[PDB]
Amino acid sequence: APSGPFYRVAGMSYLRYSNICADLLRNVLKEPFKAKAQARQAIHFRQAPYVDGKAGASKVYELENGIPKTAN
Amino acid sequence: EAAAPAGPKEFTEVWNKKAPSTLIVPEFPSNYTAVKAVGEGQVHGDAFPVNFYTPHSILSQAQKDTVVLPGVDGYFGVKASHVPTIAQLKPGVVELHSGAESEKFFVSGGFAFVHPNGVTDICVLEAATLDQVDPAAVKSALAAASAAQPTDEFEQAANRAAIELYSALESAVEAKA
Amino acid sequence: SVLAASKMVGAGCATIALAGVGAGLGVMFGSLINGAARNPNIAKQLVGYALLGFALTESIALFSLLVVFLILFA
Amino acid sequence: SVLAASKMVGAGCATIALAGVGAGLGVMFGSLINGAARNPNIAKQLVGYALLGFALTESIALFSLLVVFLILFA
Amino acid sequence: SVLAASKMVGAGCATIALAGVGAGLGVMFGSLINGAARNPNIAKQLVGYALLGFALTESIALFSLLVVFLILFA
Amino acid sequence: SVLAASKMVGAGCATIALAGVGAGLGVMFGSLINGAARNPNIAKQLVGYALLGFALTESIALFSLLVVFLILFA
Amino acid sequence: SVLAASKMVGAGCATIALAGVGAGLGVMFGSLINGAARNPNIAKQLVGYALLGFALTESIALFSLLVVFLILFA
Amino acid sequence: SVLAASKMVGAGCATIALAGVGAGLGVMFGSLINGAARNPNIAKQLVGYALLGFALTESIALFSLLVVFLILFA
Amino acid sequence: SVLAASKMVGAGCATIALAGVGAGLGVMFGSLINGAARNPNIAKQLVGYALLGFALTESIALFSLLVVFLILFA
Amino acid sequence: SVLAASKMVGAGCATIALAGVGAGLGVMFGSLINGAARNPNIAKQLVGYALLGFALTESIALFSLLVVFLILFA
Amino acid sequence: GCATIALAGVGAGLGVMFGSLINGAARNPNIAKQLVGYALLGFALTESIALFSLLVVFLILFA
Amino acid sequence: LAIADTYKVRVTFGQASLIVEELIKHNPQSYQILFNKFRSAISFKPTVATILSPDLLEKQLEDVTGNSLDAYDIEASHERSDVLRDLTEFHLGVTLYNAMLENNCS
Secondary structure, eight states, X not given: OOOSSTTXXXXXXXXXXXXXXXXXXXXXXXXXXXXXXXXXXXXXXEEEOOSSSSOOOOEEEEESSOSOSSOO | OOOOOOSHHHHHHHHHHHSOTTSOOOBOGGGGOOOOSSSOOXXXXXXXXXXXXXXSOEEEOSEESEEEEEBSSOEEEEOTTOOOEEEOBOSOEEEEESSSOEEEEEEOOOOEEXXXXXXXXXXXXXXXXXXXXXXXXXXXXXXHHTTOOOSOHHHHHHHHHHHHHHHHHHHHHTTOO | OOHXXXXXXXXXXXXXXXXXXXXXXXXXXXXXXXXXXHOTTSTTTHHHHHHHHHHHHHHHHHXXXXXXXXXXXX | OOHHHHHHHHHHTTGGGHHHHHHHHHXXXXXXXXXXXXXXXXXXXXXXXXXXXXXXXXXXXXXXXHHHHHHHOO | XXXXXXXHHHHHHHGGGXXXXXXXXXHHHHHHHHHHTTOGGXXXXXXXXXXXXXXXXXXXXXXXXXXXXXXXXX | OHHHHHHHHHHHHHGGGGHHHHHXXXXXXXXXXXXXXXXXXXXXXXXXXXXXXXXXXXXHHHXXXXXXXXXXXX | OHHHHHHHXXXXXXXXXXXXXXXXXXXXXXXXXXXXXXOGGGTTHHHHHHHHHHHHHHHHHHHHHHHHHHHHHO | OHHHHHHHHHHHHHGGGHHHHHHHHHHHHHHHHHHHHHOTTXXXXXXXXXXXXXXXXXXXXXXXXXXXXXXXXX | OOHHHHHHHHHHTTGGGHHHHHHHHHHHHHHHHHXXXXXXXXXXXXXXXXXXXXXXXXXXXXXXXXXXXXXXXX | OHHHHXXXXXXXXXXXXHHHHHHHHHHHHHHHXXXXXXXXXGHHHHHHHHHHHHHHHHHHHHHHHHHHHHTTOO | OGGGGHHHHHHHHXXXXXXXXXXXXXXXXXXXXXXXXXXXXXXXXXXXXXXXXXXXXXXXXXX | OEEESOSSSOOOXXXXXXXXXXXXXXXXXXXXXXXEEEOSSSXXXXXXXEEEOIIIIITTTTOSSSOSGGGXXXXXXXXXXXXXXXXHHHHHHHHHHHHHHHHHHO
16 A cells, blocks of 8 residues: 555554564574663553543563564 | 754753752753764775664664665665765565675665765664575464455555565575575 | 659558557567556546547557558558 | 659658657657656656657657658649 | 669668667566565566556557558559 | 759668657656756756757757758758 | 669768767766756856867767768769 | 769778767767766766777777778879 | 669668767767866876777777778778 | 679678677676776676687687688688 | 578677676576576577577578 | 553563554654653653654644755665654654653653
């Protein structure tokens, strides 16, 4: 449906593609460096939309591996 | 067409009318950069400032004389008074040279700009030195990356990026100097 | 039979203008493949422009084939 | 009958100028497809330039065909 | 025998219009490689335009071979 | 009438000097399409440059046609 | 009268220098359109370089036409 | 008088080697335009590079025009 | 004396190989401009590449001239 | 002396392939400049490909220069 | 004589392919050898046209 | 929207990328990020950093007697309208990462 590069036409944003490439470069690094490159890879946060002003459901991220390779 | 000429100076002037007057002007990202694009100079012959950046590092900021950038059309090079460029980089080796000595950073991709004043800003996410990658896990992972081929074009586009980054990493690791 | 031979050696020389329209339709239908390899969501407008360009250059192809029979049978 | 032989073979060597027109219009009608695959939002401006370019380049083809008709039947 | 000797060099000079389709098919079939090396995902729609461009460019080889067939065998 | 006959094949060979101006007008009016597909806002300045560049390469074709009609009728 | 005939068919087999001169004028004044379509800020200095390239590639056009004056009349 | 008639045909068909030279200086003086449109800092040095190219690809124009006097007047 | 006439009519069609040399020199001296417009600090080395390519195509240009001399004086 | 005449007018139309190898060498020596201006740190490998390409392109030139004497002196 | 004009097109095609090799080698010098394999394979596949237009020349000359 | 629990482990760029993604789900013409610029341990004078959507307003704010963006040769795969589309998401991710890193240190 969109018109762009191979990540953009698939619905993916650019930041997810570039972080997927960063994650796959990180997974093949040297062992004096791969463990400390796991520090810059963890995604731990949460979010919650707010529709009416204070109500909204929660969405929690616990990801130590990196960005989700699966669809957003 | 550009009828809202904003900036730090215009926001300073308009912001003194709607905010309470005791509040000091909020700072801007312009206030911590002494280097711009249209500000001519910063060239000085053969060596040019190479601002090789990273989200989690600053890998280089001193002046270098030639930079090999791995753009999406192919590897190109930047000498001193190069043409202005906004080049998207495919995963490849950014070569920083100061003479005979070359430091080879294999990056993950991400853009690299050349400005009119000759400053070059390589801007990539994961920018590893090619020393710290092993040659074993790349084909070990590409054997699996050549297997999971679904119709899911999200996962298939991730597989395309996977096989292309891994193939470029392989072709950069067998071809050492 | 000087003109009845000359019409054949002119009509053979007349149809070599088809090489230009063959190369033109080659590049115009290669540009279609590049344009539909860029963004395949607009890929059925570009075939519609390829058929307009094909018709307006087969214009010139049939011009050359008009004169190749205007000097044969006319 | 050498004049009415040379007119036929001169028209046959005259109409080969329809090759270069038929290739230039091929690259123009391919550039229309390419530039309308770049940004399709101006694809009535670019078709409006394609038809001006076609109709101003085929005036060359009609010059060629006028020289053809004036060395055949004039 | 100047007419039957005329038609042989007429056919020989006539068949060099196949060079234009032999270059146009080459540049379109290289255009498909340079368009499929960019996005190998959808590289089978583009062959459906390669064969359409090949047919509509061959039409010129067909016209050239029938002008050859008519110069040789009237 | 070889003095009368030679001018026909001469002007026939001389009007081939429009094949290249047809190709050049095709590449220029395709380059305008691909350039106006970059920025549509400067697409009046581009056509103002295109008609100037046409009128100074159509004059090459007109010089070819002046040589054609001074060989033919002078 | 073979001399006065063949100098006219020779100078008539001569003018297609202007074909390739016009093709070069077409690629040059199309490269002007792409170049001034990229940055319209220097879109008058580029036309100055275009006219200097025009006047220094016309050199070949006048070099062809004065020589065909030497074939037609000297 | 086939010697002088033939040499005027030869010096006629000699100068159609200026076609590709006109196309060459056209490609050169056209890529000068986008070369100056990429970075206008170098444009006076870059047109010096273009005229250094011109004064050596004009050597082909001189190489084609001395043989026209070698055919006509030698 | 058809031999001493064929000398000149064959030399005029012998020197036609300068058109391709002019076109080749033109695209090389246009790519010199484009390449020195990308990174203008290698412009000395790129002019040294342009003159090496210009000499290595003057190889074939002087081959064409040695053939046009060998069928005039040998 | 019609046969020695035909050998000269055949060698004249036999050295036309030097235009094609000249244009091929010109696009190759322009691409040498373009590739050496992409990454100047690979320029010696690019010249090591350029001179191999020159020597293998002149194979066609010497196969054509093979026949320009094998119809003259054999 | 006029039969060997087909070597002009083969020279133009070989110059285009050996210019494209210079561009493609300047775009990833890691793969600067497989492209030369494709280059010489395509060159040998376009010497078919050269040797065809030479066997026509000696089939014109010697037959 | 409320993004929270962001400084629990640390701040990473993939995290700021996901926050940029959910700020791109609805797609405005401008972005404003308000934070505190960590000057020293004494002063954190607050900062507003602004990020415009690619040609939705950004190149429309660049065109003066021509444009200033047209100096650069776009070396993308696709057109300039997509290299700015990727480039402003990368700018949002960088600004959001630096904002929530400077804000944590302040």
